[PDB]
Short mmCIF file of C-alpha atoms and ligand atoms in Angstrom, two decimals:
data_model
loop_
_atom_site.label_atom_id
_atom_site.label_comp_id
_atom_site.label_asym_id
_atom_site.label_seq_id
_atom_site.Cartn_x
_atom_site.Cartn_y
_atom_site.Cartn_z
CA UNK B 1 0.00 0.00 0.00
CA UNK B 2 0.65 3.53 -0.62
CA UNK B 3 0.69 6.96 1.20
CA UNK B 4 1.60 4.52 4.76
CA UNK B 5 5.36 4.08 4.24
CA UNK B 6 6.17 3.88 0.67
CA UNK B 7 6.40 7.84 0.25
CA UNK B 8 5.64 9.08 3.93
CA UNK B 9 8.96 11.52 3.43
CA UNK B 10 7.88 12.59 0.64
CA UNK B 11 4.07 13.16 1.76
CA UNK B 12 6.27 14.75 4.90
CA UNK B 13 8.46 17.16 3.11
CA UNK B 14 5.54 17.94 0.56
CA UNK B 15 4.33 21.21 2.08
CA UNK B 16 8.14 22.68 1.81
CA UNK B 17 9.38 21.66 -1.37
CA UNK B 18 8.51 24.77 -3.39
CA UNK B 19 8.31 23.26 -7.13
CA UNK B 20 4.63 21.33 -5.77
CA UNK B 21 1.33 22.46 -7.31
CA UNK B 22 -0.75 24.22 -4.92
CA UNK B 23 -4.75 24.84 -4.58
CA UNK B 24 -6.74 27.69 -3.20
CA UNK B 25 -8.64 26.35 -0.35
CA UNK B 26 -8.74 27.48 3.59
CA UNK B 27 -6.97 25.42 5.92
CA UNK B 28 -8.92 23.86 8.89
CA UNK B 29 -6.24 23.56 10.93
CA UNK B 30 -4.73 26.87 10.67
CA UNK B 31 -6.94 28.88 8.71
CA UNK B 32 -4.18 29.49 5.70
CA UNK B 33 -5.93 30.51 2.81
CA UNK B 34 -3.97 28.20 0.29
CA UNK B 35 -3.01 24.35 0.21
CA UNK B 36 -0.82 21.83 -1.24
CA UNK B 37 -2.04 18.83 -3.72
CA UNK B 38 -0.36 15.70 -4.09
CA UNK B 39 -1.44 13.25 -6.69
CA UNK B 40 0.18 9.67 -6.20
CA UNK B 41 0.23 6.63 -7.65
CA UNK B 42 -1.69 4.85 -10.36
CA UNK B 43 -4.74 5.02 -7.82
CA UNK B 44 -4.20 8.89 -8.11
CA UNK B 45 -4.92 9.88 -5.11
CA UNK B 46 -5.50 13.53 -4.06
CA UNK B 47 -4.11 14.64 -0.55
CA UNK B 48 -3.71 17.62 0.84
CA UNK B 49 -0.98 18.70 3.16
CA UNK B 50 -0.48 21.94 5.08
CA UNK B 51 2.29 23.47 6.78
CA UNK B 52 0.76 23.72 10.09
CA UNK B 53 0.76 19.69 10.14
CA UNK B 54 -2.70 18.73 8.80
CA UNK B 55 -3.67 16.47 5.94
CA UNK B 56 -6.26 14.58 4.18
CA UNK B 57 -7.65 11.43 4.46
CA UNK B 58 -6.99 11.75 8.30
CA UNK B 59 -3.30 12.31 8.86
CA UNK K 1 34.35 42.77 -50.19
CA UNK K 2 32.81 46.14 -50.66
CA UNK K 3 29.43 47.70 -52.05
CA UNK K 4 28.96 46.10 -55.31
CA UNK K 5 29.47 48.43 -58.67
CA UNK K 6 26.01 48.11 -59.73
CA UNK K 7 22.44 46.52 -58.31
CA UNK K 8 23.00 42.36 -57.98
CA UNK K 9 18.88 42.35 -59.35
CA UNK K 10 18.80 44.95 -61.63
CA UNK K 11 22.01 46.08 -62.70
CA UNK K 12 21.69 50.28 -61.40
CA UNK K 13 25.18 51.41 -60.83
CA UNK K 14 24.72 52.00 -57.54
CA UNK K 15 28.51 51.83 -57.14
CA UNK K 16 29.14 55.61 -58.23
CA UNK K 17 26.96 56.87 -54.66
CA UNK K 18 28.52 53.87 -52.73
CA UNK K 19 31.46 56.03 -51.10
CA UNK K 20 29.86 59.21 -50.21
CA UNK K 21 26.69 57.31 -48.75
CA UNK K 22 29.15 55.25 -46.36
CA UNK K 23 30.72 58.54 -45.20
CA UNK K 24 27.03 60.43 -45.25
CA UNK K 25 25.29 57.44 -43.44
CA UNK K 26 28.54 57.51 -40.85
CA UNK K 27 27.56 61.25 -40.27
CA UNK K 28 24.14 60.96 -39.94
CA UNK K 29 24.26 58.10 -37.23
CA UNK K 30 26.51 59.79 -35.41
CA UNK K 31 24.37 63.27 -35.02
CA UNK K 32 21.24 60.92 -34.37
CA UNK K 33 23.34 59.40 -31.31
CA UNK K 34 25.50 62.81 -30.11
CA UNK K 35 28.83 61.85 -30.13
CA UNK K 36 28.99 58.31 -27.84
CA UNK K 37 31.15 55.55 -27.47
CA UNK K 38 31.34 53.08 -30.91
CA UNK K 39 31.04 50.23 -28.55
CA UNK K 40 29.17 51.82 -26.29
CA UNK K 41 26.47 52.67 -29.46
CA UNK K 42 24.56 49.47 -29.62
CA UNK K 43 24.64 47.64 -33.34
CA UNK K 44 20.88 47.41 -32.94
CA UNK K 45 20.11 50.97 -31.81
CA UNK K 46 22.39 52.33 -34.93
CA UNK K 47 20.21 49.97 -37.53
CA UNK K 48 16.75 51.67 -36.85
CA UNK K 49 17.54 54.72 -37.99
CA UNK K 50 15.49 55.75 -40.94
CA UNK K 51 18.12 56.12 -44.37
CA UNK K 52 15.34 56.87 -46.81
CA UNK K 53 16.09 60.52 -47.39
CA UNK K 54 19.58 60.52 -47.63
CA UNK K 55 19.66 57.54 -50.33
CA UNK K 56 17.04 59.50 -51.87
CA UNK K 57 19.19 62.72 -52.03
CA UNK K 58 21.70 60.84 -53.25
CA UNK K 59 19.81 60.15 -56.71
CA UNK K 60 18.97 56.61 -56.18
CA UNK K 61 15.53 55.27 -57.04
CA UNK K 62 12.93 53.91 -54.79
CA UNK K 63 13.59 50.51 -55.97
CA UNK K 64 13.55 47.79 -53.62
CA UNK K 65 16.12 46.12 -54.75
CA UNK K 66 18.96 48.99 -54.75
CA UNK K 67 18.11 50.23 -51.46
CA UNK K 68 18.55 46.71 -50.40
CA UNK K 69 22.05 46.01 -51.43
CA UNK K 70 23.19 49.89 -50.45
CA UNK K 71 22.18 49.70 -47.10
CA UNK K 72 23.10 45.45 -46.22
CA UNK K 73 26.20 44.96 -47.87
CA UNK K 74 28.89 44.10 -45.38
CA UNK K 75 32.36 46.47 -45.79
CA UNK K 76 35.82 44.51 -45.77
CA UNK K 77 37.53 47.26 -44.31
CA UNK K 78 35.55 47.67 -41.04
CA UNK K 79 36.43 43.74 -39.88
CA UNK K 80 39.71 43.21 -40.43
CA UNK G 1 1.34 36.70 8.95
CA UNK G 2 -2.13 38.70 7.53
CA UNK G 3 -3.94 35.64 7.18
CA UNK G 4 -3.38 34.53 10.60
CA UNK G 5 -3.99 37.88 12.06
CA UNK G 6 -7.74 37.65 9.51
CA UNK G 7 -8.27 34.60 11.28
CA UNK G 8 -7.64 36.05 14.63
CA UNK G 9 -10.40 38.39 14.12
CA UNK G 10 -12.52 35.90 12.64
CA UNK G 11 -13.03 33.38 15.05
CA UNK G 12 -12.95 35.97 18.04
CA UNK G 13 -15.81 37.67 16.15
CA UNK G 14 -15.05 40.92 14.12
CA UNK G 15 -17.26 40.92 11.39
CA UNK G 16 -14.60 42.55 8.92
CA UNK G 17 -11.55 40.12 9.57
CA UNK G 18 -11.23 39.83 5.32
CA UNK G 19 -10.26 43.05 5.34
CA UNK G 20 -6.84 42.48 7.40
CA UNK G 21 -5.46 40.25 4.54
CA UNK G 22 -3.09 41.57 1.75
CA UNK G 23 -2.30 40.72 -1.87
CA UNK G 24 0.24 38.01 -2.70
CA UNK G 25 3.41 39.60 -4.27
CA UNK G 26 5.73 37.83 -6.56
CA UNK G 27 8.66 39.66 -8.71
CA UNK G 28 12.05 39.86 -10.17
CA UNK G 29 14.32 42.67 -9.16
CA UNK G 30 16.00 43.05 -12.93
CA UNK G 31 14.62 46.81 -13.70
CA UNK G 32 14.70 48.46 -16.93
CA UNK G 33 17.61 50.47 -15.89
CA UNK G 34 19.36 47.50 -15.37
CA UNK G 35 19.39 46.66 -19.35
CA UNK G 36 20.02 49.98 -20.33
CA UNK G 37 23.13 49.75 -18.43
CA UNK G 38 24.06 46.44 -19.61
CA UNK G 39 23.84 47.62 -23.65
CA UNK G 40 25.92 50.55 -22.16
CA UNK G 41 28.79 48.22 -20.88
CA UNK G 42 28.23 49.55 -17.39
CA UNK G 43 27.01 46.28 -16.13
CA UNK G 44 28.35 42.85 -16.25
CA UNK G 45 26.81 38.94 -15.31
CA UNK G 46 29.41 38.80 -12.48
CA UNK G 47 27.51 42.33 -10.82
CA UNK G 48 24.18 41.47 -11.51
CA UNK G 49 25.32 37.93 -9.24
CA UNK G 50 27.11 39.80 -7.16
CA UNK G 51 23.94 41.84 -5.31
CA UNK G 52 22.04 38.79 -6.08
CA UNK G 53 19.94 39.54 -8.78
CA UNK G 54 20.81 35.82 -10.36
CA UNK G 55 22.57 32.76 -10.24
CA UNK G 56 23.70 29.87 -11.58
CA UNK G 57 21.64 26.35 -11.75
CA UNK G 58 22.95 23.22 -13.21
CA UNK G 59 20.57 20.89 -13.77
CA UNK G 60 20.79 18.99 -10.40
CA UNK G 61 19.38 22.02 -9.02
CA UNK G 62 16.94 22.76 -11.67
ZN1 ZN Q 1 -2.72 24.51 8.18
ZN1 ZN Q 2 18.26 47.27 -58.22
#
């Protein structure tokens, strides 16, 4: 399975690496008006990260 | 090597203006710009000035083929 | 630090906390100025590095 331990660093260091797409939506955890999209795997799935620590799909 | 003797495309000796429009042109450019460096006088800048009334004053036709070869050919004596 | 401060407001209660928020702001410092001294040969690559204005990526860095 995916999005457990095969790219946890790089679901980690997502937020901070500057060349990731990003989407305009709040942040519930922080209230930051913009968040980062990941799309992995042939599954594609969509997770958001944030800064602050939150993320989708209950991370 | 030089500015041909006549017109490559139509033959008009365009040879007998070719040494007084060099000078006149080098004249010209250099009251448009007021007095600068030659290398600090970009080769671009120097280009897009407007050499239809001097050719014209010099006799030559408004043929587009003359005008052509007065104003592009390349001069031997200014790169080596 | 505005959109924290707009949320500050908003969950304490101020009914105008979107107005403490600011425009994102992106830009390169090169200035017109800046060519017209390079085509005058008063400016080099080597100045326009050296107050940080580029740099150089190979492409590991890329
Ligand atoms: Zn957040
Ligand atoms: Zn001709």
């Amino acid at each position: 399975g995916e999005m457990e331990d095969k790219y946890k660093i790089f679901i980690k260091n997502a937020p901070f690496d500057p060349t990731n797409c990003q989407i305009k939506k709040d942040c519930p955890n922080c209230h930051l008006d913009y968040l980062t999209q990941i799309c992995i795997g042939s599954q594609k799935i969509i997770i958001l990260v944030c800064r602050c620590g939150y993320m989708s799909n209950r991370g | 090597m030089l500015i041909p003797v006549v017109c490559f495309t139509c033959g008009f000796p365009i040879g007998t203006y070719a040494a007084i429009f060099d000078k006149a042109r080098t004249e010209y450019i250099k009251t448009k710009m007021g007095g600068t460096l030659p290398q600090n006088i970009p080769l671009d800048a120097s280009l897009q000035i407007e050499l239809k009334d001097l050719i014209t004053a010099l006799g030559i036709p408004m043929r587009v083929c003359c005008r052509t070869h007065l104003i592009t050919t390349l001069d031997y004596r200014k790169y080596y | 630090q505005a959109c924290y401060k707009a949320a500050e407001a908003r969950k304490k209660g101020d009914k105008d906390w979107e107005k403490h928020k600011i425009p994102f702001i992106q830009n390169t410092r090169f200035t017109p100025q800046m060519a017209k001294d390079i085509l005058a040969g008063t400016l080099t690559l080597e100045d326009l590095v050296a107050q940080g204005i580029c740099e150089f990526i190979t492409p590991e860095e890329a």
